[PDB]
Symmetry: D4
Subunit: 220 residues, 8 copies
């Protein structure tokens, strides 16, 4: 099972770097010009380079929702799916842990914790997180799919830009927590789980809907 | 006709998400730093991920002008063209409806309504909207074309960047309403159709000119 | 000679739109947040969509320097090279003319005229314009080249990003006038040719050096 | 050995332009809106166009760490590795020298010198520089690798975006000196080597770890 | 009645300049950095210089609410109060008329029309306008009062800063229309009276409450 | 005791408006350009107009620390001091209550709650709050003092600018909570008293030190 | 005539410093956040400190228009008026000359030359400059007037804030050239007198109207 | 000599707070929007509140140059002048020491050290520092002077605004180090005395020239 564990470490390392570079760029070094575009591209380019790296071996899910979507899409065994989520959660905490150690406390903040924007209820926040992950999973499933007569497009860049779009929209509502592991890492390290179920229920449903809309309403 | 209706739902869903993520990022959460670059990339990355998703099944037109261009380009029957526009219009309203329900009223604004900039007449606004959609259709037609000895380039990223360019230029004039469905959704939900014909006449002509310049003056 | 004139109109139209969307985004609608990144991507995405459109028929030079480089690179007859430059110059003026007609006079400014930054001498400005066009031509020649065992990369996106890089650097010095036609259009329409030779000598030399460094010091 | 020296000049020229356009965009023409996103894309698009140019002949390492990684990865002889580093260091100094000559002294500053952010110790700065170069080398090694059944993606754009990500994160800590040559050029020309070993130890270790994690823990 | 009419022209001219310089600075020449602080000081310094000019002859009310407050405070006859309001309304329209003639149409906008912010109901907007004018009248009444043993403070600067405070707070809600004449001028010249009663009911009540809280609960 | 209770209502109303206009301007309507200067002037101009209004009757303390300082300075009986603090606390809650009712929930946030900046310990935060209130009380005591041969200066403007200075410095550390009532109002209405003792211990000590440094080390 | 020449040197020195600190702050060190508020306060605080310095001896006119207004107001002999204008013009050139020598050429620009904004005709620019100087002279005449029963207000701060208001409004139109000497200094040192008569005709008329409106329609 | 030492402690404490609040606001918490206006008002309002506090007892010099000017102006004995400078220097170090202890190391930076801007030579920097302190001393001497028939103006606000003007202009050149004590405090605590003589020679000469221009060329 050498090819199995190498993918688990790939999911561990890539999620570590995804959270490290993702949360790190999200750290408010400045209350100055709008960080939304910078952070959105950071998460996107982070996912783009990691899919380009470990995408051929683990799929570069780096997201319990994404792993949940392939589990729903019947493209991964239950066991491997639990293995990825643990590796993603364990890696996300590690990435935010190293980030906590290298970042000065004045700019660590709440470690880029996904908090609900004022005026955004948990019901509205859940729907936003559903649609954020729905399009994201839809893009992943349509991009990772090998069934098409055409042959064009970069996989890592298309999926990363879908994540960038999710942050260009969702950062104002929920901080764009389209990744339960990315949401779990600052919560576990700051002892703040306020409305944290939104960042699990939302993306998981959005992953399931994106896994279902594609498999039976877009490409049977 | 299973392959027919699946494309209609694809045009419905993708236009829904195109307007949801497009108008949502356009919502002025802040009168702060310039949102033009953020919104332009949002619309572009929104169209990029949707072409990457439903582009193989419906073409990912998500634009009555774009559907009008292929109708002019004789690459789609009249019936299917009317089906797409209804699906696009119905989907755009739905996307802006969900956006209205998840966005707090303080940041909904006019729901990112395409309004004419002061000092920009309806004649100047129409021309801007023509050239915005002309290059956009030109890019789509040159990108969706299968007739070339070369084999390179990502389809979804080229078309999305053409839409981004249109917003990098047209947002100052007309809000860059290169999509009558994207323009119809906030107008129907805010009861504001001021100069709304500009966002239909403009893109439709620009679509026809782009469909004609390509088919008979660029690639006969 | 049907295939000949269709490329001339392609060079005319694309340069028209290159200047229209390029200069238009460069128009200072606001002295607010830094426009450099917005304008740099605008010119780049403008060139990217135009190469994606008319690149298969005229090469999408839209630049007398670029046409000069292929003339130096012996990949185009003298006659066709003069035809392109006239079409580029004539198209650039037309693009800036339409832009002048659709843009309100309060935001037309000097029509995005390439002016030398204070403290930047004409000798320093020439060198900057040389290096701006040198890398730009180097990217074009390496990208348009068909001689390589590998097969990857998007042509239109690589060349457009090279132009974006040139504006990310050169806009502070000379406004990044890496295109004599783009520099000629506002000069002819504003009656301001101050230091205008810099935007011809600079890019032409940079085009020749880029055409020479590639053909005899990079890929013989 | 004609194919050998042509790669050395390629590493010399490309590093010259990498530092010229990289440091030049990093020059604080304005203490205004956040330059991080602009500079990050500048370095990335600079590396993207140079890989697109001289990548087929020298690999477009333009980085002693990257050359060190391939030396560790056993994909380059020791001799050629020393040749590249000298060409990179010599080219970086030349690029910053020309930049010094064309940039007015008021905006040269410290020539974009990689300085440690306050509150960031040399130990934290080293780790940040390790992870910056680790993912960067990981992306390069996974992208330059010819061993995969799939066939998609643009090489120059994936590696440049990895460098952009490194600056989107590392510019706040160390200025994102993921290139000892890019760090050596302003240090040698400003007589300021404060904490300069961090920008050599950091990237070199990060290059070795990225060269090792890929070759024996990701793709044996 | 020479001393009477000279005060009427003073109220006419000063309100003309108050609206001219007030609305003019409020004109969105740029969607860039936050204009709230600039506009708030503009209205304040406008009122400060006008009180310094015509304050000794008409009181420099330049506000139907302020004139209403002194009418409530029994410090002005009914007739003179109607004379001021007509002079203020007539002057405000004239000031916005000259501003319309000297400002290019691209930056006139809606002529700085006091519009209700999204999510701010007419009931909330009325209360904000009450408190804006309440403190403003309180400051005016306490400053114009001659009954105190102390002798210090600049009258024109204290009242202008109270108006500045009202815009520092109220511009986000209602545009800080603490002056029915300032609100009437763009409404009458743009044919837009949407929620215009809020900018009359609000300030008038706030003027009456400020005239009552001072005369019988602060200084009997 | 008519002159007694009228001062209590003055302390109630002015603190209500101080918190209403103070917290309201502090409400993050935009994560855009730096709000520090806007908020600092808002609190200052708020205190300036209120001292200009109710300063002759209650002293316009609107701050339990300021009332504590005069209690320490032996210029106010214990009873009246407790009366003011209750009126200030009761008024502050009322001001933030009305602000909560008129402000949309999307821009209410945490109601401008004084939170400690990351990296600022409670010991450092206390000292900052001491020095913020120390200079503030020093300015108040030196300004309210009637013992000097000179006769110049505006009282309300000098004290308000001292509060502005405190926010120009202290907003980055503790949000500049130089007023326990201003700090108590959002805490009691948001159920968040995290580190709230810092905003009481800090200002009270700073008030006592400022009351002591002036009375026995500056003006005996 | 010792008291005469000391006022001439006062007008020479103060205008020198008015232009030095005024134009210097207007020098675009950064195309970043809006400089209008910074420059407006700079000119205002510059005039405020100079009136506080040399106002008791020369009146601190530092403006040919202001000197023209007192010449119209019959408060100064013709001879002394010509003496001031020469001293102001000579001093303004000297102030901009020293500024030229101490400011690096990269940030000197056009030496803060009053240029007409695009879309602002010379007729509209003249009217703006009239109203800018009209209120400014009105404030000066009402502030320098000794005929009033009241006794309050700071002279230097009221006049400086009137100049600040003029720049808060006029900088977008004409750069707020309310001072022909301030407009003459960069024009004579840059050899650029384009539309320079606007900055003489405008302020002089505005000075005459302000000198007439005050003397015969405001305070006979 | 009780009245003597109380002024020394006043100069010690006020300079401590002047540097504490002055340098603290100058600390770059954010590389965002332009801090020049914020810092300029901070130093000004800091000096304004301190003159309002300890101005009646020590003069609130808080500046070795200002103390040097009164020593030149023959308004203070040599001994008292040395006493003030030691108290100012000792107090400045203490203020920056407390600031160092309360500010997190990530935002301490170089403790707001007055460094020369690139392209500004030590000769140009000296002249700028001369004119910065010259007008500042001129304002102080004209404001502290008791010889005038008029009676108006606030002393503390006029002098603080003169310091604000000096920072509105001088911060771009030298950081506006118009106070050798303010310049000495971060230099002694950061071990960085690069070009530190400029911040002593400059202000001292500017103080002497301002002390001489006033006493013998403005008010004999
Ligand atoms: C909060 C709690 C967190 C707890 C975190 C604990 C993480 C522990 C992770 C343990 C993973 C252990 C994996 C070990 C072996 C597996 O690979 C598994 C064993 O197989 P088997 O049953 O012995 O044989 C069947 C395979 N084959 C090919 C021989 C037929 N699969 C493989 O063979 C693949 C081997 C891949 C080896 C990669 C080794 C990397 C070592 C890096 C060391 C770095 C040290 C750094 C110190 C500072
Ligand atoms: C400031 C001064 C500016 C002056 C600008 C003047 C621009 C004038 C441009 C004139 C170009 C004229 C091109 C005419 C024909 C050429 O294509 C040339 C002729 O060839 P030949 O010698 O007759 O035959 C040998 C070819 N073949 C295939 C038949 C063997 N080549 C071709 O055949 C290719 C034909 C492509 C035709 C494209 C027609 C587009 C028409 C669009 C009209 C739009 C009107 C809009 C009004 C508002
Ligand atoms: C939309 C409709 C808008 C209509 C706007 C119409 C505005 C018309 C304003 C008319 C105001 C007329 C005021 C006329 C005289 C009053 O001063 C009134 C008369 O008094 P009485 O009954 O004759 O005598 C009892 C006074 N006394 C001292 C003699 C005992 N009071 C005075 O005496 C005060 C006189 C102040 C005169 C100021 C004259 C300024 C003239 C400026 C002309 C500018 C022309 C510009 C052309 C381009
Ligand atoms: C969370 C719990 C919050 C509880 C908040 C409760 C706040 C209740 C405040 C009650 C204050 C009551 C003050 C009443 C009278 C005092 O002025 C006190 C009595 O004196 P005495 O012992 O009867 O006579 C000795 C005085 N003299 C001159 C006659 C010799 N002092 C005075 O005389 C001064 C009178 C000042 C009266 C101001 C009346 C304002 C009324 C405004 C009503 C607004 C209603 C709005 C409804 C929507
Ligand atoms: C582009 C061409 C620019 C040309 C610029 C030329 C500027 C030349 C300015 C010359 C002003 C000359 C002023 C000379 C004297 C006047 O004060 C005039 C003479 O009066 P009178 O007729 O001799 O006597 C009747 C007066 N009293 C009291 C004695 C009864 N009035 C006075 O008395 C007031 C005297 C005030 C003297 C101030 C002297 C400052 C000297 C500063 C020197 C600095 C040198 C720096 C070198 C680097
Ligand atoms: C890096 C090296 C830094 C060294 C810093 C050392 C700073 C030391 C400062 C010492 C100042 C000593 C001042 C002592 C007394 C003077 O006031 C001097 C003596 O006069 P004389 O010769 O005894 O009598 C002639 C006066 N009279 C009226 C009685 C006729 N003048 C006075 O009388 C004015 C007295 C004012 C006293 C203010 C006492 C404040 C004490 C605050 C203590 C705070 C402790 C905090 C601990 C944490």
């Amino acid at each position: 099972s050498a090819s199995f564990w190498r993918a688990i470490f790939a999911e561990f390392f890539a999620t570590l770097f995804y959270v490290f570079f993702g949360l790190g760029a999200s750290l408010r070094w400045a209350p100055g010009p709008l960080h939304v575009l910078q952070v959105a591209l950071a998460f996107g380019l982070a996912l783009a380079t990691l899919v380009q790296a470990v995408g051929h071996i683990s799929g570069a899910h780096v997201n319990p929702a994404v792993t949940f979507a392939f589990l729903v899409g019947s493209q991964m065994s239950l066991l491997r799916a639990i293995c990825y989520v643990v590796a993603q959660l364990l890696g996300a905490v590690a990435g935010a842990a190293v980030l906590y150690s290298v970042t000065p406390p004045a700019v660590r903040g709440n470690l880029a914790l996904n908090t609900l924007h004022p005026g955004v209820s948990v019901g509205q926040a859940t729907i936003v997180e559903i649609f954020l992950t729905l399009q994201f999973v839809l893009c992943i499933f349509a991009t990772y799919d090998e069934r098409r007569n055409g042959r064009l497009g970069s996989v890592a860049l298309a999926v990363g830009f879908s994540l960038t779009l999710g942050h260009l929209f969702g950062m104002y509502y929920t901080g764009a927590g389209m990744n339960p592991a990315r949401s779990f890492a600052p919560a576990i390290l700051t002892r703040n789980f306020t409305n944290h179920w939104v960042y699990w229920v939302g993306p998981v449903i959005g992953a399931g809907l994106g896994s279902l809309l594609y498999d039976f309403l877009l490409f049977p």
